Amino acid sequence: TEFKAGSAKKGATLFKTRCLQCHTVEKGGPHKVGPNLHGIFGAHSGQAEGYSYTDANIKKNVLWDENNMSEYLTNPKKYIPGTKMASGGLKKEKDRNDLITYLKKAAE
Amino acid sequence: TEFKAGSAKKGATLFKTRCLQCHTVEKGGPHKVGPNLHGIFGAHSGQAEGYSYTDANIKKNVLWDENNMSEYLTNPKKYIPGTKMASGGLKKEKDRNDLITYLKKAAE
Numbered sequence: 001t002e003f004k005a006g007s008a009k010k011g012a013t014l015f016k017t018r019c020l021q022c023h024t025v026e027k028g029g030p031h032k033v034g035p036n037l038h039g040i041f042g043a044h045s046g047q048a049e050g051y052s053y054t055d056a057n058i059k060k061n062v063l064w065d066e067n068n069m070s071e072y073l074t075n076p077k078k079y080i081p082g083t084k085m086a087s088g089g090l091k092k093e094k095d096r097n098d099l100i101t102y103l104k105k106a107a108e
Numbered sequence: 109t110e111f112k113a114g115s116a117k118k119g120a121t122l123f124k125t126r127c128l129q130c131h132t133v134e135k136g137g138p139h140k141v142g143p144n145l146h147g148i149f150g151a152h153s154g155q156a157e158g159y160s161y162t163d164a165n166i167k168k169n170v171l172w173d174e175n176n177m178s179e180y181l182t183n184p185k186k187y188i189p190g191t192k193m194a195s196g197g198l199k200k201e202k203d204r205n206d207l208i209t210y211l212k213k214a215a216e
């Protein structure tokens with residue numbers, strides 16, 4: 001594809017310092033600023049029940065794969081114009097590789 | 109995305125007349141000319157154990173999503189040059205929509 005596995009340990013801590021502020025990954029985890037991400041892979045965007053997604057998000061109808069997730073994480077607002085997720089991006093592929101490896105594992 | 113659900117009933121019969129010759133979809137289904145396709149979504153190409161995939165296939169390292177599957181099904185040889193799958197393609201999007209809807213369901 002254009003995604004290579006990295007370090008889930010490395011990924012665990014990128015999550016903690018970069019995404020925990022707004023999201024949980026555990027099944028049975030609650031929505032915060034962001035929606036709980038458990039079971040995100042293979043899902044299409046804007047389908048977590050109980051969460052209030054912007055219209056941009058839902059209309060993109062993204063099928064969440066490790067490949068999509070990377071482009072997204074680069075610059076979320078360029079990928080989903082009008083998205084309310086306020087994160088500038090993970091510009092180095094190695095960090096995204098590490099983070100998705102982690103996400104791949106924990107959101108299962 | 110760029111895939112819309114269709115008819116699984118329609119999809120069931122496209123499978124039977126178009127892909128059954130070489131493939132099974134049931135979990136516990138065996139490889140034939142083609143590999144058993146159960147659990148194909150979310151998988152990367154060339155990973156069924158017990159099957160002899162060409163080098164092209166395996167090196168493409170495709171993550172199988174409903175979106176990828178469509179382009180693939182259009183013209184498999186253009187998508188994976190050197191693939192040994194001998195099928196010309198499903199040129200109408202409506203047929204591919206119907207077939208993937210079916211596959212989505214049965215290969216789960």
Ligand code: HEC
Pocket residue numbers: 015018019020021022023033034035037040044045046047048052053054055056057073082083084085086087090099
């Ligand atoms: C708060 C400052 C956030 C941070 C940091 C991160 N995300 Fe986020 N995310 C947030 C919101 C409010 C939303 C919903 C957006 C909307 O427009 O409705 C999102 C969305 C996502 C998504 C899309 C989910 C879907 O179910 O379709 C994903 C995949 C996602 N967030 C993941 C994610 C990751 C991995 C983060 C760290 C790299 C991250 N987000 C940061 C809020 C915030």
Ligand code: HEC
Pocket residue numbers: 123126127128129130131141142143145148152153154155156160161162163164165181190191192193194195198207
């Ligand atoms: C025999 C005449 C086939 C027909 C008709 C179809 N497929 Fe096939 N397929 C066949 C082979 C021998 C192989 C392996 C190719 C190789 O280069 O190693 C394949 C491969 C696939 C794949 C890729 C699978 C993977 O696990 O990576 C898929 C997704 C697939 N086949 C699906 C498929 C569908 C849905 C078909 C009907 C539309 C179909 N194939 C036709 C042999 C033959």
